[PDB]
Amino acid sequence: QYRIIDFKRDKDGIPGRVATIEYDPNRSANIALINYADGEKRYIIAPKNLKVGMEIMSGPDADIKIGNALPLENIPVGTLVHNIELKPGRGGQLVRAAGTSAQVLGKEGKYVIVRLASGEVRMILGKCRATVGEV
Amino acid sequence: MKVIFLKDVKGKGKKGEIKNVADGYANNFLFKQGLAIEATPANLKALEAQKQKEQRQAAEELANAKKLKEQLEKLTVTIPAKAGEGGRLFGSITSKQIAESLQAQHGLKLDKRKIELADAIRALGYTNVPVKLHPEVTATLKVHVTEQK
């Protein structure tokens, strides 16, 4: 019964609650069920240390909390991130749910420099989103 | 043969680059690729008219940018915003907000592309933003970011 994971995190403004956190053998990672304030339900890869009960939000006004998803430009330098988007509104294509969360190193103009766990460094457009936390 | 160049000149010589081209060749190549046209006394006067209107327009525009620059320099846009950390904002005030508050409060509809903001305003206070109303007309827009909530 392989579940549907939300790698888009586009329910901006609408608060959600970590309903549960379970393992997904098809993803060799944990996933969480999120119940949103509007009735919608969605699964997400559960960052490290995310617990049942905590709130989740996405978008420019989101709080900088593990599990929250925001455009790279709205994220504090030094924060660890995963499920990094390469193209605004195309969902995350980098660190989706396996590996090691990258890290914001600097913000320049319309770019956000990020160092992948491989020491690799990339300057992604701030418009691209990423989830706070360790995968 | 005199000819009215429609295209291939300094970009588009369609303004009215009237040059005497070799007859035949003209009507065999230029006239063929729509590059030039017969310098008939009708399509010559008809050209004059377009150049005359293009010249009037360019002047209206300049005159408008100039009056518009006067209206702007008397205003003060007021954008309230959530701040905390020593006046520091939670988000950033950019060209679209500024453009919007300008329309909403002053009745001016300006393209945000003209608001020459560099780095997005991320702090409470006053900021003089340049506005490029025209190639040779820039005005100073005073923007005022106030703490809300």
mmCIF file of C-alpha atoms in Angstrom:
data_model
loop_
_atom_site.group_PDB
_atom_site.id
_atom_site.type_symbol
_atom_site.label_atom_id
_atom_site.label_comp_id
_atom_site.label_asym_id
_atom_site.label_seq_id
_atom_site.Cartn_x
_atom_site.Cartn_y
_atom_site.Cartn_z
ATOM 1 C CA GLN A 1 0.000 0.000 0.000
ATOM 2 C CA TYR A 2 2.461 2.653 -1.124
ATOM 3 C CA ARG A 3 1.222 6.080 -0.022
ATOM 4 C CA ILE A 4 1.074 9.343 -1.941
ATOM 5 C CA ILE A 5 3.724 11.834 -0.701
ATOM 6 C CA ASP A 6 3.407 15.601 -1.077
ATOM 7 C CA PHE A 7 6.695 16.915 -2.401
ATOM 8 C CA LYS A 8 5.015 20.121 -3.534
ATOM 9 C CA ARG A 9 4.036 21.613 -0.161
ATOM 10 C CA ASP A 10 1.841 24.252 -1.824
ATOM 11 C CA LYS A 11 -0.987 24.520 0.750
ATOM 12 C CA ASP A 12 0.285 27.939 1.771
ATOM 13 C CA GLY A 13 -1.331 29.741 4.653
ATOM 14 C CA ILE A 14 -3.371 26.726 5.710
ATOM 15 C CA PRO A 15 -2.231 25.218 9.070
ATOM 16 C CA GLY A 16 -1.809 21.462 9.397
ATOM 17 C CA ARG A 17 -1.162 19.108 12.302
ATOM 18 C CA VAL A 18 1.194 16.146 12.326
ATOM 19 C CA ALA A 19 -1.412 13.428 12.723
ATOM 20 C CA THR A 20 0.935 10.465 12.809
ATOM 21 C CA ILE A 21 4.424 9.411 11.874
ATOM 22 C CA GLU A 22 5.024 6.008 10.368
ATOM 23 C CA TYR A 23 7.615 4.151 8.378
ATOM 24 C CA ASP A 24 7.412 3.754 4.611
ATOM 25 C CA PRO A 25 9.439 0.735 3.437
ATOM 26 C CA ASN A 26 8.991 1.909 -0.177
ATOM 27 C CA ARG A 27 10.878 5.039 0.875
ATOM 28 C CA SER A 28 13.095 3.513 3.570
ATOM 29 C CA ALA A 29 12.081 6.641 5.471
ATOM 30 C CA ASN A 30 9.401 7.871 7.848
ATOM 31 C CA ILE A 31 6.380 9.754 6.648
ATOM 32 C CA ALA A 32 3.827 11.790 8.525
ATOM 33 C CA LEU A 33 0.121 12.201 8.039
ATOM 34 C CA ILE A 34 -0.864 15.843 8.057
ATOM 35 C CA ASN A 35 -4.402 16.977 8.743
ATOM 36 C CA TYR A 36 -4.986 20.499 7.436
ATOM 37 C CA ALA A 37 -7.353 23.112 8.903
ATOM 38 C CA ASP A 38 -9.446 22.915 5.729
ATOM 39 C CA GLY A 39 -10.116 19.201 5.881
ATOM 40 C CA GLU A 40 -7.456 18.048 3.437
ATOM 41 C CA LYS A 41 -5.100 15.239 4.416
ATOM 42 C CA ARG A 42 -1.570 14.772 3.106
ATOM 43 C CA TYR A 43 1.560 12.732 3.730
ATOM 44 C CA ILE A 44 5.035 14.166 3.895
ATOM 45 C CA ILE A 45 8.451 12.761 4.615
ATOM 46 C CA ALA A 46 8.876 13.271 8.325
ATOM 47 C CA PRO A 47 12.005 15.271 9.152
ATOM 48 C CA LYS A 48 14.140 14.150 12.086
ATOM 49 C CA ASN A 49 12.665 14.988 15.494
ATOM 50 C CA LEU A 50 9.196 15.835 14.107
ATOM 51 C CA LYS A 51 6.555 14.625 16.541
ATOM 52 C CA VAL A 52 2.833 13.940 16.525
ATOM 53 C CA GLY A 53 1.009 17.042 17.528
ATOM 54 C CA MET A 54 3.316 19.725 16.117
ATOM 55 C CA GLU A 55 1.918 22.213 13.622
ATOM 56 C CA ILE A 56 3.155 22.574 10.087
ATOM 57 C CA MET A 57 2.908 25.461 7.633
ATOM 58 C CA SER A 58 4.319 26.369 4.246
ATOM 59 C CA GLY A 59 4.815 29.599 2.340
ATOM 60 C CA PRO A 60 6.612 32.941 2.923
ATOM 61 C CA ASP A 61 5.040 33.497 6.361
ATOM 62 C CA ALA A 62 5.716 30.006 7.654
ATOM 63 C CA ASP A 63 7.520 29.776 10.952
ATOM 64 C CA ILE A 64 11.089 28.438 10.646
ATOM 65 C CA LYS A 65 10.314 25.043 12.142
ATOM 66 C CA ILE A 66 11.306 21.550 11.096
ATOM 67 C CA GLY A 67 8.737 20.284 8.628
ATOM 68 C CA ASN A 68 7.797 23.734 7.404
ATOM 69 C CA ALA A 69 8.338 24.519 3.718
ATOM 70 C CA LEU A 70 9.249 27.963 2.400
ATOM 71 C CA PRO A 71 10.914 29.632 -0.571
ATOM 72 C CA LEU A 72 14.683 29.511 -0.013
ATOM 73 C CA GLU A 73 14.744 33.303 0.190
ATOM 74 C CA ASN A 74 12.664 33.155 3.373
ATOM 75 C CA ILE A 75 15.045 30.797 5.106
ATOM 76 C CA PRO A 76 17.794 31.774 7.642
ATOM 77 C CA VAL A 77 21.392 31.166 6.661
ATOM 78 C CA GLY A 78 22.714 28.154 8.498
ATOM 79 C CA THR A 79 19.464 26.230 8.513
ATOM 80 C CA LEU A 80 19.471 22.626 7.327
ATOM 81 C CA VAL A 81 17.088 21.727 4.530
ATOM 82 C CA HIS A 82 15.816 18.946 2.328
ATOM 83 C CA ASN A 83 13.367 18.311 -0.531
ATOM 84 C CA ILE A 84 14.947 21.217 -2.338
ATOM 85 C CA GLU A 85 13.134 22.658 -5.326
ATOM 86 C CA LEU A 86 15.111 23.390 -8.445
ATOM 87 C CA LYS A 87 12.242 25.046 -10.272
ATOM 88 C CA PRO A 88 9.692 27.181 -8.424
ATOM 89 C CA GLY A 89 6.454 25.204 -8.184
ATOM 90 C CA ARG A 90 7.814 21.949 -9.613
ATOM 91 C CA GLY A 91 8.209 20.306 -6.251
ATOM 92 C CA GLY A 92 11.453 19.230 -4.651
ATOM 93 C CA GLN A 93 13.815 17.158 -6.757
ATOM 94 C CA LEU A 94 16.792 17.255 -4.432
ATOM 95 C CA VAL A 95 17.076 15.324 -1.129
ATOM 96 C CA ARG A 96 13.410 14.356 -1.431
ATOM 97 C CA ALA A 97 13.562 11.735 1.314
ATOM 98 C CA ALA A 98 16.900 9.954 1.314
ATOM 99 C CA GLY A 99 20.380 11.145 2.188
ATOM 100 C CA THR A 100 21.523 14.159 4.159
ATOM 101 C CA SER A 101 19.878 17.577 4.300
ATOM 102 C CA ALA A 102 21.773 20.340 2.498
ATOM 103 C CA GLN A 103 22.353 23.696 4.155
ATOM 104 C CA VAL A 104 21.783 27.369 3.354
ATOM 105 C CA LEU A 105 25.154 29.139 3.258
ATOM 106 C CA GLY A 106 24.304 32.530 1.836
ATOM 107 C CA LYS A 107 21.707 34.570 -0.022
ATOM 108 C CA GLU A 108 22.679 36.817 -2.942
ATOM 109 C CA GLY A 109 20.213 38.874 -4.921
ATOM 110 C CA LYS A 110 17.752 36.428 -6.461
ATOM 111 C CA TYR A 111 19.833 33.412 -5.454
ATOM 112 C CA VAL A 112 20.311 31.254 -2.399
ATOM 113 C CA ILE A 113 23.612 29.370 -2.146
ATOM 114 C CA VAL A 114 23.289 25.892 -0.702
ATOM 115 C CA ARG A 115 25.842 23.267 0.212
ATOM 116 C CA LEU A 116 24.615 19.724 -0.387
ATOM 117 C CA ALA A 117 25.712 17.021 2.044
ATOM 118 C CA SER A 118 28.288 15.979 -0.592
ATOM 119 C CA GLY A 119 30.231 19.197 -0.057
ATOM 120 C CA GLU A 120 28.700 20.213 -3.352
ATOM 121 C CA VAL A 121 27.594 23.829 -3.601
ATOM 122 C CA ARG A 122 24.705 25.224 -5.678
ATOM 123 C CA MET A 123 23.123 28.627 -6.195
ATOM 124 C CA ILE A 124 19.381 27.998 -6.474
ATOM 125 C CA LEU A 125 16.771 30.673 -7.132
ATOM 126 C CA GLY A 126 15.296 31.979 -3.887
ATOM 127 C CA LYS A 127 11.847 31.352 -5.392
ATOM 128 C CA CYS A 128 12.543 27.643 -5.098
ATOM 129 C CA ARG A 129 11.162 26.056 -1.938
ATOM 130 C CA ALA A 130 12.757 23.703 0.594
ATOM 131 C CA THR A 131 11.659 22.013 3.847
ATOM 132 C CA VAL A 132 13.366 22.830 7.106
ATOM 133 C CA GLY A 133 14.823 19.784 8.819
ATOM 134 C CA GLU A 134 17.015 16.736 8.479
ATOM 135 C CA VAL A 135 16.123 13.812 6.279
ATOM 136 C CA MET B 1 15.272 55.476 -58.502
ATOM 137 C CA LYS B 2 14.380 57.125 -55.174
ATOM 138 C CA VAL B 3 13.123 54.641 -52.598
ATOM 139 C CA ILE B 4 11.495 54.718 -49.131
ATOM 140 C CA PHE B 5 13.307 52.155 -46.972
ATOM 141 C CA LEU B 6 10.855 50.072 -44.936
ATOM 142 C CA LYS B 7 13.332 47.844 -43.070
ATOM 143 C CA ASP B 8 17.022 46.960 -43.641
ATOM 144 C CA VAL B 9 18.782 50.158 -42.490
ATOM 145 C CA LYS B 10 20.055 50.979 -38.982
ATOM 146 C CA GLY B 11 17.701 48.332 -37.685
ATOM 147 C CA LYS B 12 14.382 49.585 -39.082
ATOM 148 C CA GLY B 13 14.856 52.626 -41.324
ATOM 149 C CA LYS B 14 11.087 52.572 -41.716
ATOM 150 C CA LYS B 15 11.163 56.057 -40.133
ATOM 151 C CA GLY B 16 11.639 57.321 -43.654
ATOM 152 C CA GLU B 17 15.133 56.614 -44.918
ATOM 153 C CA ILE B 18 14.608 57.921 -48.460
ATOM 154 C CA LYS B 19 17.514 56.853 -50.677
ATOM 155 C CA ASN B 20 17.938 56.702 -54.451
ATOM 156 C CA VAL B 21 18.418 53.007 -55.234
ATOM 157 C CA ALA B 22 19.169 51.504 -58.641
ATOM 158 C CA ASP B 23 15.923 50.987 -60.546
ATOM 159 C CA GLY B 24 15.279 47.360 -61.461
ATOM 160 C CA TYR B 25 17.531 45.944 -58.705
ATOM 161 C CA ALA B 26 15.282 47.895 -56.388
ATOM 162 C CA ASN B 27 12.133 46.380 -57.888
ATOM 163 C CA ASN B 28 13.853 42.984 -58.129
ATOM 164 C CA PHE B 29 15.293 42.609 -54.611
ATOM 165 C CA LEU B 30 14.397 45.434 -52.183
ATOM 166 C CA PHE B 31 10.869 45.724 -53.556
ATOM 167 C CA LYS B 32 10.906 41.944 -53.479
ATOM 168 C CA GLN B 33 11.709 41.417 -49.808
ATOM 169 C CA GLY B 34 9.543 44.323 -48.640
ATOM 170 C CA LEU B 35 12.738 46.222 -47.767
ATOM 171 C CA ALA B 36 11.890 49.400 -49.693
ATOM 172 C CA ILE B 37 8.997 51.035 -51.524
ATOM 173 C CA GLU B 38 8.382 53.410 -54.454
ATOM 174 C CA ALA B 39 9.191 57.011 -53.497
ATOM 175 C CA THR B 40 5.879 58.168 -54.985
ATOM 176 C CA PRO B 41 4.796 61.697 -53.963
ATOM 177 C CA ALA B 42 1.952 60.013 -52.036
ATOM 178 C CA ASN B 43 3.994 57.447 -50.129
ATOM 179 C CA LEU B 44 6.417 60.324 -49.487
ATOM 180 C CA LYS B 45 3.889 62.648 -47.908
ATOM 181 C CA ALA B 46 2.270 59.652 -46.206
ATOM 182 C CA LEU B 47 5.683 58.899 -44.729
ATOM 183 C CA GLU B 48 6.090 62.484 -43.562
ATOM 184 C CA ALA B 49 2.822 62.197 -41.673
ATOM 185 C CA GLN B 50 3.989 59.113 -39.708
ATOM 186 C CA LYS B 51 7.291 60.737 -38.840
ATOM 187 C CA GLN B 52 5.355 63.785 -37.751
ATOM 188 C CA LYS B 53 3.106 61.774 -35.479
ATOM 189 C CA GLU B 54 5.964 59.702 -34.035
ATOM 190 C CA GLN B 55 7.635 63.024 -33.161
ATOM 191 C CA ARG B 56 4.483 64.396 -31.509
ATOM 192 C CA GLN B 57 4.026 61.258 -29.454
ATOM 193 C CA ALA B 58 7.579 61.131 -28.238
ATOM 194 C CA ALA B 59 6.998 64.659 -27.013
ATOM 195 C CA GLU B 60 3.728 63.954 -25.277
ATOM 196 C CA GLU B 61 5.347 61.121 -23.474
ATOM 197 C CA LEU B 62 8.259 63.190 -22.267
ATOM 198 C CA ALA B 63 5.916 65.924 -21.167
ATOM 199 C CA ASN B 64 3.824 63.391 -19.289
ATOM 200 C CA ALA B 65 6.800 61.770 -17.518
ATOM 201 C CA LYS B 66 7.721 65.254 -16.431
ATOM 202 C CA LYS B 67 4.339 66.124 -14.925
ATOM 203 C CA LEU B 68 4.176 62.685 -13.385
ATOM 204 C CA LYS B 69 7.565 63.227 -11.763
ATOM 205 C CA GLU B 70 6.075 66.288 -10.068
ATOM 206 C CA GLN B 71 3.094 64.458 -8.711
ATOM 207 C CA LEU B 72 5.305 61.681 -7.241
ATOM 208 C CA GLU B 73 7.784 63.917 -5.478
ATOM 209 C CA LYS B 74 5.001 65.390 -3.358
ATOM 210 C CA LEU B 75 3.715 61.927 -2.118
ATOM 211 C CA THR B 76 4.806 59.514 0.581
ATOM 212 C CA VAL B 77 3.837 55.868 0.279
ATOM 213 C CA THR B 78 2.958 54.271 3.620
ATOM 214 C CA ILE B 79 3.526 50.551 3.843
ATOM 215 C CA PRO B 80 2.871 49.125 7.335
ATOM 216 C CA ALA B 81 4.554 45.901 8.258
ATOM 217 C CA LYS B 82 5.227 43.324 10.943
ATOM 218 C CA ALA B 83 8.654 43.914 12.488
ATOM 219 C CA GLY B 84 10.410 42.757 15.579
ATOM 220 C CA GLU B 85 14.177 42.294 15.822
ATOM 221 C CA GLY B 86 15.258 45.941 16.254
ATOM 222 C CA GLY B 87 12.974 47.341 13.584
ATOM 223 C CA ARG B 88 13.810 44.466 11.326
ATOM 224 C CA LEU B 89 10.929 43.120 9.228
ATOM 225 C CA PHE B 90 9.560 39.580 9.095
ATOM 226 C CA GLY B 91 9.261 39.638 5.317
ATOM 227 C CA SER B 92 10.330 42.231 2.740
ATOM 228 C CA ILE B 93 8.682 45.161 1.067
ATOM 229 C CA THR B 94 9.257 44.955 -2.665
ATOM 230 C CA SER B 95 8.294 46.787 -5.876
ATOM 231 C CA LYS B 96 4.836 45.195 -6.136
ATOM 232 C CA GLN B 97 3.785 46.285 -2.686
ATOM 233 C CA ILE B 98 5.108 49.782 -3.296
ATOM 234 C CA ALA B 99 3.347 49.903 -6.641
ATOM 235 C CA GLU B 100 0.090 48.724 -4.962
ATOM 236 C CA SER B 101 0.149 51.123 -2.034
ATOM 237 C CA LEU B 102 0.788 53.832 -4.552
ATOM 238 C CA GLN B 103 -2.302 52.942 -6.568
ATOM 239 C CA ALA B 104 -4.446 52.366 -3.500
ATOM 240 C CA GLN B 105 -3.463 55.562 -1.720
ATOM 241 C CA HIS B 106 -2.650 58.032 -4.418
ATOM 242 C CA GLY B 107 -4.616 56.913 -7.422
ATOM 243 C CA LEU B 108 -1.530 56.332 -9.514
ATOM 244 C CA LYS B 109 -1.152 53.130 -11.522
ATOM 245 C CA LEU B 110 2.626 52.760 -12.170
ATOM 246 C CA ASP B 111 4.415 49.701 -13.598
ATOM 247 C CA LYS B 112 6.444 48.076 -10.891
ATOM 248 C CA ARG B 113 9.282 47.790 -13.459
ATOM 249 C CA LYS B 114 9.891 51.514 -13.121
ATOM 250 C CA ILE B 115 10.403 51.323 -9.358
ATOM 251 C CA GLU B 116 14.142 50.933 -9.311
ATOM 252 C CA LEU B 117 14.331 49.125 -5.949
ATOM 253 C CA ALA B 118 17.563 47.127 -5.603
ATOM 254 C CA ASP B 119 17.560 45.002 -2.503
ATOM 255 C CA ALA B 120 14.088 44.496 -0.911
ATOM 256 C CA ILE B 121 13.393 46.825 2.057
ATOM 257 C CA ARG B 122 13.706 44.728 5.256
ATOM 258 C CA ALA B 123 13.508 47.362 7.987
ATOM 259 C CA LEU B 124 11.174 49.980 9.473
ATOM 260 C CA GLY B 125 11.757 53.641 8.441
ATOM 261 C CA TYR B 126 11.962 55.931 5.384
ATOM 262 C CA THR B 127 13.448 55.046 1.992
ATOM 263 C CA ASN B 128 13.760 57.242 -1.092
ATOM 264 C CA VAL B 129 13.277 54.910 -4.087
ATOM 265 C CA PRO B 130 14.184 56.087 -7.676
ATOM 266 C CA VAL B 131 11.505 55.779 -10.366
ATOM 267 C CA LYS B 132 12.497 55.626 -14.012
ATOM 268 C CA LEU B 133 9.537 57.227 -15.664
ATOM 269 C CA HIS B 134 11.384 57.747 -18.937
ATOM 270 C CA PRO B 135 14.913 57.441 -20.534
ATOM 271 C CA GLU B 136 15.688 60.873 -19.247
ATOM 272 C CA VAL B 137 13.138 61.308 -16.415
ATOM 273 C CA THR B 138 13.621 59.782 -12.920
ATOM 274 C CA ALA B 139 11.728 60.833 -9.789
ATOM 275 C CA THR B 140 12.318 60.137 -6.120
ATOM 276 C CA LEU B 141 9.509 58.217 -4.396
ATOM 277 C CA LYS B 142 9.538 58.508 -0.593
ATOM 278 C CA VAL B 143 8.518 55.239 0.903
ATOM 279 C CA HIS B 144 7.563 54.968 4.610
ATOM 280 C CA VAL B 145 7.481 51.526 6.302
ATOM 281 C CA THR B 146 5.578 51.570 9.622
ATOM 282 C CA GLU B 147 5.235 48.729 12.176
ATOM 283 C CA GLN B 148 1.785 47.230 12.257
ATOM 284 C CA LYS B 149 -0.194 44.927 14.608
#
